[PDB]
Design an enzyme around this catalytic site. Sequence first.
Site, PDB file in Angstrom:
ATOM      1  N   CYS A   1      -1.551 -52.224  33.977  1.00 45.53           N
ATOM      2  CA  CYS A   1      -0.901 -52.261  35.260  1.00 45.53           C
ATOM      3  C   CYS A   1       0.572 -52.116  34.957  1.00 45.53           C
ATOM      4  O   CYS A   1       0.987 -52.494  33.863  1.00 45.53           O
ATOM      5  CB  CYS A   1      -1.182 -53.594  35.969  1.00 45.53           C
ATOM      6  SG  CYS A   1      -2.942 -53.932  36.236  1.00 45.53           S
TER       7      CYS A   1
ATOM      8  N   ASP B   1      -4.262 -56.373  44.693  1.00 45.60           N
ATOM      9  CA  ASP B   1      -5.135 -57.452  45.082  1.00 45.60           C
ATOM     10  C   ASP B   1      -6.332 -56.921  45.852  1.00 45.60           C
ATOM     11  O   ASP B   1      -6.320 -56.818  47.074  1.00 45.60           O
ATOM     12  CB  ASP B   1      -4.424 -58.553  45.870  1.00 45.60           C
ATOM     13  CG  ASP B   1      -5.336 -59.738  46.100  1.00 45.60           C
ATOM     14  OD1 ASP B   1      -5.560 -60.512  45.140  1.00 45.60           O
ATOM     15  OD2 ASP B   1      -5.843 -59.918  47.226  1.00 45.60           O
TER      16      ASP B   1
END
EC number: 3.1.3.16
Length: 193
Positions: free
Chosen positions: A107, A80
């Site tokens: 990811c 994030d």
Amino acid sequence: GHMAETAAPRSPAWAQAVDPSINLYRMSPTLYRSALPNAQSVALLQRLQVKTVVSFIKDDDRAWLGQAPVRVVSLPTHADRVDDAEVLSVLRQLQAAEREGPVLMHCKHGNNRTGLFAAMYRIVVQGWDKQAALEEMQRGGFGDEDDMRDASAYVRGADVDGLRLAMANGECSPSRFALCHVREWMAQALDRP
């Protein structure tokens, strides 16, 4: 792998599992998507001309590639971090790497956040059509083009404050490994007899 294949719409002409080991699918030949940065991917990468893989490593990427001159890249797309400034920073990176061939962005556990970029990146930098988002849209990243699922998560980060503070707090924050000096210092080959 042991993934329950009984999901998704009818067999996508676009995304097909090329390697269900690392969860790499074939997506549009100007970008690729996977999930697992496993060292067995090296041979596959070579075939697909994927000389750019987004993975996290302290040492040189050569530690798992062995002799494959694939460039592992450090993206601003963190778990994030991705602000309105970071997103651009991602966008311009892959389109730069595309000059050498297809790029694998992924990811390990963040398939939706990968789709975030993979869907619309090619539209804004390459001039692809909004419909081209369909690939990761049906993958679940966007889910829907209009009533977008994960896209809004990034957007909650890309705010007025999110943008200004990204700038305001983005000063004097370099990377020492990939930017200072130790990048590609380890070895050129760590495999092959």
